[PDB]
Amino acid sequence: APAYLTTHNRTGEESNAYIAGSIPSLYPTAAYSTNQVYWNLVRLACYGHTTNGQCPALIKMATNTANPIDIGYVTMDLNTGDITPKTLSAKGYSLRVIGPGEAEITKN
């Protein structure tokens, strides 16, 4: 398992993971910022939403605005940190999985 979940937000809008599609995490990644979440905190964020060490989340942009933007669903193995959908592309945003427990969000 990786030490941290590392998120590279390369957009001008805040990103966040909505656990099981509905529950905002406490660890949003601010604009033009990299953020690293200790792995135990991740495990807990996913507590109650984990089956077979797998946990899904919906990724949103403009998470600190009135109108957030649904980018698409992802699932992660909490023991390998492997993120199954290698890319997303929706609402003129793109997500790319870089390796276990790290990914970047770009605009377009």
Numbering used by the authors: 1 to 108
What sentences appear in the manuscript?
L. pneumophila also expresses a type II secretion system (T2SS). The Legionella T2SS exports at least 25 proteins. In summary, using a combined cellular, structural, biophysical and biochemical approach we have provided a characterization of three novel type II secreted substrates, NttA, NttC and NttE, that are required for infection of several species of amoeba. We also report the X-ray crystal structures of NttE and NttC, the solution nuclear magnetic resonance (NMR) structure of NttA and dynamic analyses for each substrate using complementary biophysical techniques.
NttC is a 130-amino acid protein encoded by the lpw18401 ORF in 130b strain (lpg1809 in strain Philadelphia-1; lpp1772 in strain Paris; lpl1773 in strain Lens). We readily obtained crystals of NttC at pH 8.0 and determined its structure using selenium multi-wavelength anomalous dispersion (Se-MAD) and refined electron density maps to 3.1 Å. The final model of NttC contains two identical molecules in the asymmetric unit (RMSD over Cα atoms of 0.080 Å) and all residues could be built except for the N-terminal His6 tags. NttC has an immunoglobulin-like fold composed of one α-helix and ten β-strands, and residues Cys46 and Cys55 form a disulfide bond between the α1-helix and β5-strand. However, NttC is unusual in that it lacks a compact core and instead contains a buried internal cavity. This is formed primarily by the sidechains of hydrophobic residues and is inaccessible to the solvent. Analysis of the structure using fpocket revealed that the cavity inside the protein has a volume of 782 Å3 and a druggability score of 0.97, which strongly suggests that this pocket may be able to bind one or more organic molecules. Furthermore, when we analyzed all known sequences of NttC homologs and mapped the sequence conservation onto the NttC structure, we observed only minor patches on the NttC surface while many of the residues that form the internal cavity were highly conserved. In our crystal structure, we could not detect any access to the cavity but using MD we were able to observe a breathable core and a transient ∼12 Å diameter solvent accessible channel form over the course of the simulations. Due to the restricted access to this pocket we expect that a large cofactor is inserted during the folding of NttC, prior to its secretion from the periplasm.
